[PDB]
């Protein structure tokens, strides 16, 4: 049969019945997507920071 | 030896200085409302004598009554009315006039009657229709002790303190105005005037700004 193809009528009512959320950011994002050279050094630049912190407290 | 009577002597003492504080602060407000209106009246007389035109201070407070019901409202004025706590017809709220609120009023203009409330209408609305939001729970004001329990940290201790923070837009206007649960007004007692409400007041309806004629309308709704 002939049918109504497409409409976006009533689509923003459903989009706001459950209240659109911004994506809930965090401190310390994932290092996926970073330049792998920078992440590789950052493993060591934070390992040695912990060694210089844990030995200095004890 | 449960020792009530010394505590009742202390409580009835402490109520007496508290009413003494309220009585002198109401006398302080009563003199300052009187000199303020006398100064504005004399300033106009002085400017007319000195060939000039006294231009009044622009109004810092409006009182917004929602005059339209619930159905068929577009999404943008619907959200502004909720943020002004006008969630049903004939609800009222005082609104401090800034540019951020002068543009809220222009969005909801065909749903509200607003205008500039006088001391008398502020006094009568808070006396007759004044309620507090206390554990949200809508408490009628009815006693000065339940204002000081909730607004004493801003130095508001009586009902006439609360009117004073509304008419003179004080530094704690926001806390005093959001304390007041929105005024649940009746329909106006001599009707509206105006055979059709939902045109502008300028063209002969009710909505929008009726600058000082809000006092006739709200006292009819009170």
């Amino acid at each position: 049969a002939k049918s109504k193809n497409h409409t976006a009528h009533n689509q923003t009512r459903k989009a706001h019945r459950n209240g659109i959320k911004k994506p809930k950011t965090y401190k310390y994002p994932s290092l996926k997507g970073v330049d792998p050279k920078f992440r590789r050094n950052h493993k060591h630049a934070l390992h040695g920071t912990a060694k210089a912190l844990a030995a200095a407290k004890k | 030896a449960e020792q009530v009577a010394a505590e009742r002597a202390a409580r009835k003492a402490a109520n007496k200085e508290k009413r003494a504080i309220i009585l002198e602060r109401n006398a302080a407000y009563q003199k300052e409302y009187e000199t303020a209106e006398r100064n504005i009246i004399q300033a106009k007389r002085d400017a007319k004598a000195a060939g000039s035109y006294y231009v009044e201070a622009q109004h810092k407070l409006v009182f917004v009554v929602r005059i339209k019901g619930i159905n068929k409202i577009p999404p943008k004025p619907r959200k502004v009315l909720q943020l002004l706590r006008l969630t049903r017809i004939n609800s009222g709220t005082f609104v401090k006039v800034t540019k951020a609120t002068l543009e809220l009023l222009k969005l909801i203009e065909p749903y509200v009657a607003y205008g500039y409330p006088s001391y008398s209408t502020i006094r009568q609305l808070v006396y007759k229709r004044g309620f507090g939001k206390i554990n949200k729970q809508r408490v009628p004001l009815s006693d000065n002790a339940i204002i000081e329990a909730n607004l004493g940290k801003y130095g508001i201790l009586s009902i006439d303190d609360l009117i004073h923070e509304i008419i003179t837009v004080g530094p704690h206007f926001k806390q005093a105005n959001n304390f007041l649960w929105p005024f649940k007004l009746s329909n106006p007692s001599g009707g509206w005037g105006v055979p059709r409400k939902f045109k502008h007041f300028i063209q002969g309806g009710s909505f929008g700004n009726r600058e000082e004629f809000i006092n006739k309308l709200v006292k009819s709704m009170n």
């Binding site: - | 009585l23 109401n26 006398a27 004399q42 007389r45 007319k48 006396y127 006693d143 000065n144």
Partner: protein, 51 residues
């Protein structure tokens, strides 16, 4: 249990606002104003009655 209206019921008008007694005493709501004799400028009334 029952909200009584100040602006009726003088007892609740005095429970709130102890100055309500003093306002009614000195009558304070029908108080006179001093009679000052300011007159407007000539340019004010001429501009008022201008065509």
């Amino acid at each position: 249990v029952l909200k009584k209206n100040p602006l009726k019921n003088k007892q609740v008008l005095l429970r709130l606002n102890p100055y309500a007694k003093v306002f009614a005493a000195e009558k304070l709501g029908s108080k006179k104003a001093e009679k000052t004799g300011t007159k407007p400028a000539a340019v004010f009334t001429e501009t008022l009655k201008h065509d």
